[PDB]
Amino acid sequence: IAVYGPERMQKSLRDLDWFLRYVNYSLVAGDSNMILLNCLGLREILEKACSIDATIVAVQEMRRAATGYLKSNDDKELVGSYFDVIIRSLNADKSDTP
Amino acid sequence: MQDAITSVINTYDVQGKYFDTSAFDKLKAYYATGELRVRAAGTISANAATIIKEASAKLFSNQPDLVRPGGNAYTTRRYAACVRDMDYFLRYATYAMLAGDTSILDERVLNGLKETYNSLGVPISSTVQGIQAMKEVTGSLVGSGAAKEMGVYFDYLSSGLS
Amino acid sequence: MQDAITSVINTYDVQGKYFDTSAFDKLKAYYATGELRVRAAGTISANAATIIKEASAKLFSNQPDLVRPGGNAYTTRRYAACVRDMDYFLRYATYAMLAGDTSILDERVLNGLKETYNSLGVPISSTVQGIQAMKEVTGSLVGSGAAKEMGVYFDYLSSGLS
Amino acid sequence: MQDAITSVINTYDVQGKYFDTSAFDKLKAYYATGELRVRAAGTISANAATIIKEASAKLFSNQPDLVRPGGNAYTTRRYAACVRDMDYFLRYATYAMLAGDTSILDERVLNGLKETYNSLGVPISSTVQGIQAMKEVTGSLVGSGAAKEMGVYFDYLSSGLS
Amino acid sequence: MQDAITSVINTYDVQGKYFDTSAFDKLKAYYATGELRVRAAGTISANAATIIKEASAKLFSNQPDLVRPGGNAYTTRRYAACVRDMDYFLRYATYAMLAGDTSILDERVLNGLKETYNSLGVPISSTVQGIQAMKEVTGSLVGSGAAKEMGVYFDYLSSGLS
Amino acid sequence: MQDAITSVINTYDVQGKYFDTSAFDKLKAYYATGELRVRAAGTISANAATIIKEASAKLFSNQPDLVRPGGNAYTTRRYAACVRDMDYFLRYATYAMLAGDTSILDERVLNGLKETYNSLGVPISSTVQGIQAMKEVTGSLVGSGAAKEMGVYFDYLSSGLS
Amino acid sequence: MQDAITSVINTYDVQGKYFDTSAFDKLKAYYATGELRVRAAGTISANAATIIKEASAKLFSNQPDLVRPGGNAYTTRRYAACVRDMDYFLRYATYAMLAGDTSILDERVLNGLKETYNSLGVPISSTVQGIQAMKEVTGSLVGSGAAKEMGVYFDYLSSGLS
Amino acid sequence: SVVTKAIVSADAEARYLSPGELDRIRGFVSSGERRLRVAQTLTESRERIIKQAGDQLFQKRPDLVSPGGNAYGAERTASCLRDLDYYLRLVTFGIVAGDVTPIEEIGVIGVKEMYRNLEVPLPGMVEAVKAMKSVATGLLSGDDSAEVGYYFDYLAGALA
Amino acid sequence: SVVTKAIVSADAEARYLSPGELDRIRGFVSSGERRLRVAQTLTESRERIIKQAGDQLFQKRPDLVSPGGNAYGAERTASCLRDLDYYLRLVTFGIVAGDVTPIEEIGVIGVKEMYRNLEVPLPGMVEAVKAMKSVATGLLSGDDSAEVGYYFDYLAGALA
Amino acid sequence: SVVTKAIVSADAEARYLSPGELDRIRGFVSSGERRLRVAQTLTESRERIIKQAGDQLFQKRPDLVSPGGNAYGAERTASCLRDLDYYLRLVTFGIVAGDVTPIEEIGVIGVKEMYRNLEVPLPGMVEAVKAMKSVATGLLSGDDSAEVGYYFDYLAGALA
Amino acid sequence: TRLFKVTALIPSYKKVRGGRELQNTYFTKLVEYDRWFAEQQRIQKQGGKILSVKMVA
Ligand SMILES: CCC1=C(C)/C(=C/C2=NC(=C\c3[nH]c(/C=C4\NC(=O)[C@H](C)[C@H]4CC)c(C)c3CCC(=O)O)/C(CCC(=O)O)=C2C)NC1=O
Ligand SMILES: CCC1=C(C)/C(=C/C2=NC(=C\c3[nH]c(/C=C4\NC(=O)[C@H](C)[C@H]4CC)c(C)c3CCC(=O)O)/C(CCC(=O)O)=C2C)NC1=O
Ligand SMILES: CCC1=C(C)/C(=C/C2=NC(=C\c3[nH]c(/C=C4\NC(=O)[C@H](C)[C@H]4CC)c(C)c3CCC(=O)O)/C(CCC(=O)O)=C2C)NC1=O
Ligand SMILES: CCC1=C(C)/C(=C/C2=NC(=C\c3[nH]c(/C=C4\NC(=O)[C@H](C)[C@H]4CC)c(C)c3CCC(=O)O)/C(CCC(=O)O)=C2C)NC1=O
Ligand SMILES: CCC1=C(C)/C(=C/C2=NC(=C\c3[nH]c(/C=C4\NC(=O)[C@H](C)[C@H]4CC)c(C)c3CCC(=O)O)/C(CCC(=O)O)=C2C)NC1=O
Ligand SMILES: CCC1=C(C)/C(=C/C2=NC(=C\c3[nH]c(/C=C4\NC(=O)[C@H](C)[C@H]4CC)c(C)c3CCC(=O)O)/C(CCC(=O)O)=C2C)NC1=O
Ligand SMILES: CCC1=C(C)/C(=C/C2=NC(=C\c3[nH]c(/C=C4\NC(=O)[C@H](C)[C@H]4CC)c(C)c3CCC(=O)O)/C(CCC(=O)O)=C2C)NC1=O
Ligand SMILES: CCC1=C(C)/C(=C/C2=NC(=C\c3[nH]c(/C=C4\NC(=O)[C@H](C)[C@H]4CC)c(C)c3CCC(=O)O)/C(CCC(=O)O)=C2C)NC1=O
Ligand SMILES: CCC1=C(C)/C(=C/C2=NC(=C\c3[nH]c(/C=C4\NC(=O)[C@H](C)[C@H]4CC)c(C)c3CCC(=O)O)/C(CCC(=O)O)=C2C)NC1=O
Incomplete structure (x- = not known):
């Protein structure tokens, strides 16, 4: 926490909250399109001042935590897909943005 | 366009916070009428021509001057344009009912409607009367519960015209 | 200008026709709504400064670029113009609501407003947002029944600008 | 668009005159600066992505509400649109600097931009701040004289938006 | 468009009436003048380039400023646009003379033309003077009655540009 | 109407930023040229009638048809309007030079001037020639540097008309 | 569609190898012939109309039936098609001359022309004779060195259409 | 009309009328008086034509006035005769105009949609048009009957 | 201009100028002094060039100034020479601009229609511009003669 | 190349080459020998550029050769070096042609899709090309170094 | 001289297209005589190859 400083910590926390908020929104809308499109361009923005591997670990951890509370196989698979879209997009942006 | 879902999502995204009790209440109210609205939409989509027939019959019986010479609906072309x-x-009222939002009406009917009818000379009051007749017919066809949901958007269109 | 009573009178005068059952039905509808309209008009007259107060504050809170330097509402002159x-x-929505007709809105406000705003550089999206702000601010003060009535005139103004 | 040579040609053609001593002096002045302009344009094309990075970073640091919920840069979509x-x-300021005239700016950027942002909701003042930030970023990379020349066109863009 | 026969047909159709003696008299008048109209149209079509030549020569001789540098007709492109x-x-005066009605003149020339010249900077007074020149040149070739008939439509164009 | 100082003030108020070194530099440059501007303005004011006399003499010698019958300056009335x-x-070129900004020309001189002259029938090209003759006369009286300064405003007027 | 330089680039790129010294010698050859090629191109651009004049004249002189009725040039439309x-x-021969390669001829002239003429019935022999007529005169104007160098492109066109 | 069609056709290619369509206009104009006389005959005899056409239609197609028919009832029969009157007037307009353009614009564009909304059998309209054509051509001489018959034929084909 | 063409070609592709376009601009600005000298020589000699070229044109084609010719008369001859002055000014504009764009956009677009309206024989105009080519290239050095002649040949081909 | 672009531009509007196009072709051919000398120098020492650029890139971005990186492994490093060799050859081709059309046509159009298929980080392209540019500009003289570095600059911008 | 039946293949050299564009590349149309010169020129400028043309009427 100390190395980044208050600004990057605030950005990181609001970004994790952002991910989970968009997961909720997409579950409401019936489509993970908003998460998808908002993640087609995220890695190039993050890379210089952020760790992509750290973000992937964070999204996987949130996936595990969210799947824990659901206690229903269909619910678990749906939320797992709506997080796997985030992991998939950050993985797809290994080269430049599309 | 927008629907109720998009409106709530944007309202809470601009604030940057999750759904509160009022949000979940709005979504539950929107979802509760969903099957009724889809049934009404199926009825209208299936029987649109019929509704046009009784609506036009009522409108032109109440105002025969429209289809007599010197009226705005006097020709085959202008009668066809009226029923069109x-x-x-x-159709756009059905779209708005299924969406739950009047954004589609403002975007794709009201935007340029007054310019069109004032350029062409179409009587706006008579168009409002035709919309009201359509409301009555479609309400009689789809049941009172769906009649109210149709009527809110029919009134939105009527107020947009007048 | 024109109200509901005068609208019916003019329709029957151009037809050279007599007041029939439909005309008296419309007249009865207006007389039935009259007391609600008058109560709403008095309430809005009482709280007009408050309504402008709150609507301006909310519009400039949702879109703070207007009041910061470089915004269309950034100066004392331009802010006062926005408030005016x-x-x-x-005031004109209240006139139209009390009359029961939007002809006054058309002729006194909407005939030439788009071109004035486009020549001035005034944003029209933000003006529609301010109208919606006034709409849902006055809706709380007048009550749900009177809000449903004043809302159609606010939406008429918004659709005329949009 | 027109460059310095075309500007002088137009000024002398509308008067129906051949080039006098002043015209040739001005043309020679433009020709003397051509190599500097080409070198500056190559340097800017070298670091265009860089300059965008520092300019956007400085803008969003000094304007943090842009990327917060309710800001117009708060999205990856809206962020990409802003950086584009x-x-x-x-790109167009570099075109103007290379041409030696501000005509391309007015023709292809400034004309209709304020109304475009008013429709979209884009804050003009924040865009002016971003242009200024781009100016300080570009000046250091291009050097003193190239910075004066190149910042003339950035100032033209800012004033046109202002 | 609309011609004399279509004009009478439309006037009687809006009323819903059959043709009577006055309408038949108007139709007979048009049928009487048809042969003269056809001769005049053929003569004009044979000599259109000539008439344009003398009219342009007259206009640019009486107003040589139009074709000197700084004038509206000063270039090959703008001179060609003028003669076009x-x-x-x-051509449209000939069309109107053949049809016997000025409807085509309105629809295909005069709707939006004054705004176009106002934007372009075209001197409408000089255009009207050129139209009057074409009128007098055409009259000599076409003869007395054909000249009166053509002058009706030339004056209609001139007053429409007003 | 805005001068160089007012332009700096506005371009810093739109940003909301206070004055920094660059603004003080531009203001210092304006004060550096202020003495030249004041001397040129005083010289032009002292000899306005003379300048008009040689400029009009040159224009009417180069284009004698203007003051002959059938020319737009053939009347005591129209000649007086011409020299006016x-x-x-x-006078307005002197204003613009003294302000250091071409804003007053667009703001009070060139706005609707083309439409006005085209409605009057005034030759635009000959007016531009009069402006150029006035430029040549003014330059010799004001000296080389002040002539180079006044030339940008005279050329601005000539390009605005043409 | 490729010149000599892009042709050698292609033949060295397909092999995946870098340029050898023989490639550099081939390149020096074209760079040394470039000024002669450009001079011939300018001459041909200046004299293209005259070359068409005399080439059509000689072609229709040697073969009289083509212009006479029953010939594959006997029509105003068909005459214009032949000269076109x-x-x-x-023009394409001059293009191939400047490029130094016949690839443009294949890609923009012989691409579909052979079978187009075959379907239309254009005689191959007359077309080859016309190509020869143009070549042996163009070589006279362009000089012997450029004559031999247009020889390859003209007889390439002849052999391709053959 | 003939003049309108010729002029708009010439306008579509930005050119003056060729001598062929000038002969067009001349031929149309030289035939004006006969067209006016035929319009006289049709207009003066409208009342008899409408009644005779209604009787012929209703005897040939009794189902329309039969119970459950479209024209059943005095008011609906009156509307049918009103439609016949409209189309006779449109025929007169077409005769004077020299083409079917008035018929086209006023009573042909959107007529199928109009009657489909009105639940009107188009075959009934065709039969009515044929009957009124026969009645009208009965009054006119052979040369004029041949001319008006094609206007009626165009109306019948448009309704079909 | 050359800079304008490079800029708009880059703009069409939504990119910055390629090394080829920057090299083109470097070449164009490297020749600025030569172009200025050539344009100043042509401007200094405008009266002499117009006088001599008009003389050559009129002796080569006396029909233009003979009775019944288009240039017959003092005023029409003055207009004839004024046109040549216009085109010489356009040629100087093209020299300084580095391309034939000013000539193209002031005195080449609609030139055939303009001179058709003025009954001006285009072959006469071509002969006039060839005479101007000869007279001007006589004044210039060998290197600049070809450069000026290219614009003159372009203008001749445009008129032809 | 330059003449190819000029011919395409001339044929686009169906005319002979403009005087300006002829001047740009003369400027191209006049500098052809210097372009060929640059080609000499870049082609001869290709190994120095490629190896030094690879070393600089790997030092700047150690994650590329680190396990889990795209360049990790001997074969993948060989593919890295082969890609750098390809881009050096294309840069020499563009130097010869006088335009970046060889570079673009061979390995710029669709480069992003291919490198997305390979997971190649485009910043890796940018840094490798910048190292190549540094070495090439160092081994050349200033007048040549600027012009050559323009091509590397275009390639880096295309990758970025 | 009424109609031409033209089969031609215009490839794509400027970019890679995500949509189908298979029938846009390889196609056969009937082209009017007055339009065949311009159409052939357009196909040639596009870089495409005109495989064969026959005479229809
Ligand atoms: C759901 C839709 C969505 C998300 C999540 C999103 C993230 C996002 N975070 C940003 C800032 C930032 N984000 C981060 C890093 C954070 N980023 C996270 O992925 C990590 C958990 C964490 C660090 C480990 C940092 C350091 C910044 C500061 C700007 C910079 O990186 O240079 C930015 C750039 C705008 C700005 O400067 O504020 C975006 C677009 N954008 C979206 O449209
Ligand atoms: C969904 C968005 C949308 C709307 C709203 C719309 C309205 C519309 N109605 C039109 C015609 C018309 N519309 C009417 C309306 C009737 N007149 C009668 O009196 C009644 C009062 C009234 C209906 C109850 C008439 C008579 C015309 C023909 C007028 C003419 O062309 O002269 C036209 C002109 C274009 C055309 O004729 O095809 C438009 C644009 N079009 C759209 O794409
Ligand atoms: C450059 C010209 C200019 C000025 C000056 C200006 C003043 C200004 N003052 C405001 C509010 C305010 N202004 C004040 C200041 C007052 N409080 C005390 O009573 C004092 C007597 C007094 C200060 C000495 C306060 C407290 C508010 C907040 C009121 C509110 O938020 O409702 C706002 C609204 C801010 C927004 O909507 O986001 C503006 C625009 N605006 C301009 O464009
Ligand atoms: C129809 C109305 C009308 C009038 C009256 C008129 C007068 C007039 N006289 C002029 C010249 C002149 N006018 C005069 C006459 C003066 N010489 C003596 O002092 C006398 C006091 C006096 C005559 C009795 C002279 C000497 C000039 C020559 C001025 C010069 O060239 O310097 C000019 C300048 C243009 C030209 O020379 O053609 C005008 C406009 N113009 C008009 O359109
Ligand atoms: C840029 C490459 C290219 C060329 C040149 C080309 C020419 C061409 N010539 C055509 C017909 C023609 N071509 C010719 C010319 C030939 N007949 C005789 O006169 C001569 C022996 C010979 C000229 C050397 C003629 C006369 C016609 C019209 C004959 C007809 O109507 O069938 C056509 C058919 C379409 C049309 O004419 O509108 C084309 C496309 N097409 C191309 O893609
Ligand atoms: C000038 C162009 C024009 C036409 C043609 C036209 C026809 C027309 N016929 C109508 C009614 C009618 N039309 C008919 C005629 C049908 N009955 C039989 O089945 C026959 C097949 C057929 C007649 C031959 C009938 C029975 C009605 C009454 C149906 C109703 O009450 O809706 C109506 C509805 C208005 C009214 O009832 O007064 C129209 C608009 N209107 C026009 O503006
Ligand atoms: C800047 C571009 C430009 C050009 C080129 C131009 C040409 C031009 N030439 C004109 C007349 C003329 N031009 C000529 C010249 C021709 N006579 C012989 O045939 C020669 C072959 C040839 C000259 C070498 C002549 C004789 C006239 C007088 C025509 C007449 O009085 O009827 C006119 C009409 C001027 C008037 O009297 O109102 C124009 C506008 N205008 C322009 O704005
Ligand atoms: C001339 C046009 C052209 C280019 C440019 C081109 C590039 C190219 N590089 C490839 C492999 C590769 N390229 C690289 C190099 C990259 N990865 C590292 O991270 C570095 C950042 C970076 C080098 C600076 C690597 C590591 C591979 C191996 C990837 C694999 O085989 O899975 C491949 C896959 C096929 C093969 O290697 O045979 C292609 C097609 N191909 C072409 O036809
Ligand atoms: C949806 C149905 C569909 C198909 C199937 C299709 C195939 C197709 N492939 C094309 C080009 C191409 N296709 C390939 C791929 C080939 N080369 C490799 O070695 C492989 C052996 C092989 C593919 C497995 C290549 C290399 C090109 C470019 C060829 C060139 O332009 O020279 C093109 C030309 C248009 C373009 O380049 O964008 C088409 C139409 N297009 C379609 O719309």
């Missing part, structure tokens, strides 16, 4: 406009109004 | 326009919008 | 607008401004 | 406008005026 | 217009151009 | 074909052949 009525079909437009019915 | 909103005060017109409230 | 920044790309537009840098 | 005169050619279109002549 | 020439005085307008000289 | 010869003009296009000359």
